[PDB]
Design a binder for this molecule. Structure first.
Ligand SMILES: [Mg+2]
Ligand SMILES: [Mg+2]
Ligand SMILES: [Zn+2]
Ligand SMILES: [Zn+2]
Ligand SMILES: [Zn+2]
Ligand SMILES: [Zn+2]
Lengths: 449, 449
């Protein structure tokens, strides 16, 4: 039952050119914040991850989609906020590696242990560590793993796989890149094979391709991983209709949704940023991607469906949702693809908050794995990297720059970034904290021994 | 028994390679956060601005000087945090201009009105608006304006000058660039002249150069501003010895410290970042500036002195302290200079917090005017801009990149950034807010009518 307040509106209250018109606050927040602090148990937890969604990414998407004085009804609505560090470790020296990759950072919040770039569910000694999801299951809680990326990718994989390298998607890659994890060598298996063992109640995302591979050993040797899932009682859905038809999800009938061969379709289309793109060419206006589809479930829909099915568990549930392509498009220096995925994540967050506000014992956390390349710069900027001018909702031009790599892919950045929370124990994300603190925060909120 | 807690230790608690070793938290924070919330009146306010000190800057400086798992005793110690927006306005259209300069942002928090880049104390219609310092004085509270930059620069000027352009330092500049403000033309005069009129109790910084000019009119025409200063009852000091001598600071003997012709000297020195610097050049270890001087007050010293002289006013006081060269060095793509000035600012922040915890009715706020160019990237990064490898306290290499400009100066970025506070009404910086909210937050906390 409703009791802890969600920020209803932090947009500019009026005329931004007038005194007080750009204010996002309408009065003192001391009482609102006190009402936002509760140490009661967290029955459920919904962790929404925006891959590469640093503060810069959030601002750029707000400016374009909601206007500078706009307000993300989801992302900007969490009352308790802070900044956390996501540095990784050098595998050999054990010293800090200032710029993490997705695997190391996801392993940090899901296991509570720092690790080297590329590792999933293991530390620098390559020792396995239980994930928050495996722990949630073990305690009898329902579990959900949702993503717009291929399920073998770092963020969703980190919750159910323990491999020496994120590249070990299926048997083939594992045999070659993770010999110690290869099933035919006595290991736990590839990422996909371990995901099948983790047996979370709900798993929705892309990456159907790897399931076409066949196991090299074990009870399901010779069969495709898809065939294995069928044989192990999984109910596989591949589109919006089939997913909507699902009435239950549990250990007897775990749900596995494969909605795309690889990553799911991005929300918006737009040209890639170019050298001196803001000075030479004209401004870009993003446009809806025709490949999006009504047959393809949206992040928001997968989030609602997951919540519906998971909420059935009286004990409670842990659910993770990742807006994966914010990061992917940031790499491809594609403003529209990037901003579109942030807008996409915001809707998912809205479903999570709307649900949590009514339920009353749900902790919702919104953050990112690491910071990224994109920067909002002056219109007349002449940079060495890739830049693009964009027509925002304000009817003004915004210029974005990607200048930390001459290579094709734009790199990650080590800056600390925003972490926001709402609900029981949300106070633990305020101020300065570490990405590994999030693991302990979730563990404690759910009361996991 | 100080009820309002100041985060004493959020550094990695143990061995970062071990489970929980990188955790910055030791237990649940709900109670501590509740003890941090008070709506009682704020007798005093200390606003510390790190020019161009976005989260990236804070992270790089912490990484280098304290280690990734380190902790800034000052900057990282404020318990209530959020992210605020600082977009400015297009003067002609009145629409948002995504990347502000120091002038528009400073104007925003000091007056509560958004404006165009370059404007100081006026909106897009060039109309004046009271500053928080002018209002504080009018209310009978002591006023302090401190900066490591030339006092005519945007940040400290925004508190005491209303001009159409930030370039209007003195008579000459004003006459040519701010004719409507030019004294001999009916206006209120240049930034320096208006500063003298504002007459804050304490004004410490550099920018002596401009005081050499002579008024082109007014009750002090022909004389130099320095002369007009002393002629108007100003108590002028120019070094640590003299400054440390002043025992009072009020309207009859307003203190005016001019410790440098232009900007005050930087704390640290290092080579400028270069193309492929991290690859082609050796890792750098910052060196203390031999000419920082012991006859030159440090930001922390000026902060401490200011507080002494201003706290004698039983009514209360408002003090703004700026670590200016973080921004400037960031513009010069100079990691060491940039980091050194952040370390510098952290010391002043510790003094403010130390005083605030004791006094119990002081609101301390730490933030920045806008984000900057510097980014922490991967060691092997091959970027198109300027890079440099640095030897951190961790005994490991950190690479910093600047690639948002091909010109001489690296530029600002529009990303929302961290704002943290401690004391009465600190809750108003939490969550998403706007830079203009800060003006209103300070005005209300002090209860200025
Ligand atoms: Mg991902
Ligand atoms: Mg400044
Ligand atoms: Zn990522
Ligand atoms: Zn990435
Ligand atoms: Zn600035
Ligand atoms: Zn600047």
């Amino acid at each position: 039952t409703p009791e802890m307040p969600v920020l209803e509106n932090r947009a500019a209250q009026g005329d931004i050119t007038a005194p007080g018109g750009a204010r996002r606050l309408t009065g003192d927040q001391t009482a609102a914040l006190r009402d936002s602090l509760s140490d009661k148990p967290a029955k459920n937890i919904i962790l929404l991850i925006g891959d590469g969604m640093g503060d810069s990414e959030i601002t750029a998407a707000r400016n374009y989609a909601e206007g500078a004085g706009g307000f993300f009804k989801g992302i900007d609505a969490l009352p308790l906020t802070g900044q956390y560090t996501h540095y990784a470790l050098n595998k050999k020296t054990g010293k800090p590696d200032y710029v993490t990759d997705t695997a190391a950072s996801a392993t940090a919040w899901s296991t509570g242990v720092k690790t080297y770039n590329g590792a999933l569910g293991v530390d620098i000694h390559e020792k396995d560590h239980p994930t928050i999801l495996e722990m949630a299951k073990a305690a009898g809680l329902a579990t959900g793993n949702v993503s717009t990326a291929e399920l073998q990718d770092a963020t969703p994989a980190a919750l159910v796989a323990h491999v020496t390298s994120r590249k070990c998607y299926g048997p083939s890659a594992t045999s070659e890149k993770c010999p110690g994890n290869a099933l035919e060598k006595g290991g736990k298996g590839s990422i996909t094979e371990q995901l099948l063992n983790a047996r979370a109640d709900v798993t929705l995302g892309g990456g159907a391709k790897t399931f076409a591979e066949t196991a090299t050993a074990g009870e399901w040797q010779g069969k495709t991983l898809r065939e294995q899932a069928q044989a192990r009682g999984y109910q596989l859905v591949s589109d919006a209709a089939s997913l909507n038809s699902v009435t239950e999800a549990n250990q007897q009938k775990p749900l596995l949704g494969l909605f795309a061969d690889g990553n799911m379709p991005v929300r918006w289309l737009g040209p890639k940023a170019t050298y001196h793109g803001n000075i030479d060419k004209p401004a870009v206006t993003c446009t809806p991607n025709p490949q999006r589809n009504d047959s393809v479930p949206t992040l928001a829909q997968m989030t609602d469906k997951a919540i519906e099915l998971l909420s059935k568990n009286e004990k409670g549930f842990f659910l993770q949702v990742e807006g994966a392509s914010i990061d992917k498009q940031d790499h491809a220096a594609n403003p529209c693809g990037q901003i579109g995925e942030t807008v996409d994540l915001d809707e998912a967050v809205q479903r999570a908050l709307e649900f949590a506000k009514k339920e009353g014992n749900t902790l919702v956390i919104v953050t990112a794995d690491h910071a990224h390349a994109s920067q909002i710069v002056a219109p007349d900027t002449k940079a060495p990297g890739l830049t693009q001018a964009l027509n925002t909702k304000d009817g003004a031009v915004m210029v974005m720059s990607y200048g930390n790599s001459e290579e094709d892919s734009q790199e990650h950045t080590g800056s600390q970034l925003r972490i926001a929370a709402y609900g029981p124990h949300a106070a633990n994300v305020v101020g300065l904290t570490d990405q590994t603190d999030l693991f302990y925060t979730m563990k404690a909120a759910l009361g996991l021994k």
